[PDB]
């Protein structure tokens, strides 16, 4: 890679012969037998990182990198999701607790996400059926739009 980045265009520089300076265009790829996309792939991967601590500009109040965050949570969806997640079970209040207490969180939810169909088969009512039915029962004990009809704005 660190040689293609310094050869793909080098060649072209000379390969420019029979062409107009920067020879052809994606024929370059073909010239070196490659696919543009990989080319950009290589083109993109060149030069170097910027300082990220260099003056913003002619002025000061400026080393770069005074200068981003990726992620916190955008306070907005941390006060959201908790409400949502918590409510996903906090509004689980339109059913008898035979399912409300178990299938509540599918086979996981809040969990890494799992302890499953078997387990409940035993873990709760020595079932293997009753999982799917009472779960489906509750799986509908919330959908006809009136069941748990306090979080319809969810539209999610």
């Amino acid at each position: 890679l660190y040689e293609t980045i310094s050869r793909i265009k080098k060649t072209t520089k000379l390969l420019s012969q029979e062409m107009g300076r920067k020879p052809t265009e994606e024929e370059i790829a073909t010239r070196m037998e490659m696919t543009i996309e990989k080319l950009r792939f290589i083109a993109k991967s060149a030069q170097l990182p910027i300082s990220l601590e260099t003056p913003i500009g002619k002025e000061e109040d400026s080393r770069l990198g005074d200068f981003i965050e990726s992620d916190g949570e955008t306070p907005e969806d941390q006060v959201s999701k908790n409400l949502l997640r918590e409510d996903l079970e906090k509004v689980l209040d339109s059913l008898s607790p035979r399912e409300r207490d178990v299938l509540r969180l599918r086979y996981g939810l809040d969990d890494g996400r799992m302890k499953t169909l078997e387990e409940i088969g035993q873990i709760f009512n020595v079932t293997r059926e009753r999982i799917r039915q009472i779960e489906a029962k509750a799986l509908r004990k919330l959908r006809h739009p009136n069941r748990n009809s306090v979080l319809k704005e969810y539209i999610r």
Partner: protein
């Protein structure tokens, strides 16, 4: 013109490093800040504003958020977090040989 010279916002992305929000005079521009005033905000003290006034709008994640909630959660926004940037400063120092 007040248009390009307007400015005011309620939190948003903090930084990376300090992870503090950041005012480069943008739509989410730090209400900028002046310690010359934190050198005039103690003349009456009563921490609280200060206490907040750093914390939870600077370091504490769970503070800041704590807030968000408290109000929309009908809760008495608590008690500082503890700052952390502090801890950040402490970290490099500990490595520097602290």
């Amino acid at each position: 013109l007040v248009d390009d010279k307007i400015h005011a916002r309620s939190t948003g992305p903090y930084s990376l490093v300090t992870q503090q929000p950041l005012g480069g005079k943008a739509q989410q521009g730090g209400q900028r800040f002046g310690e010359m005033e934190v050198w005039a905000l103690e003349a009456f003290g009563a921490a609280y504003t200060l206490q907040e006034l750093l914390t939870v709008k600077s370091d504490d994640m769970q503070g800041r958020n704590e807030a968000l909630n408290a109000i929309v959660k009908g809760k008495a926004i608590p008690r500082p977090g503890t700052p952390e940037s502090f801890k950040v400063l402490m970290r490099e120092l500990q490595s520097l040989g602290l």
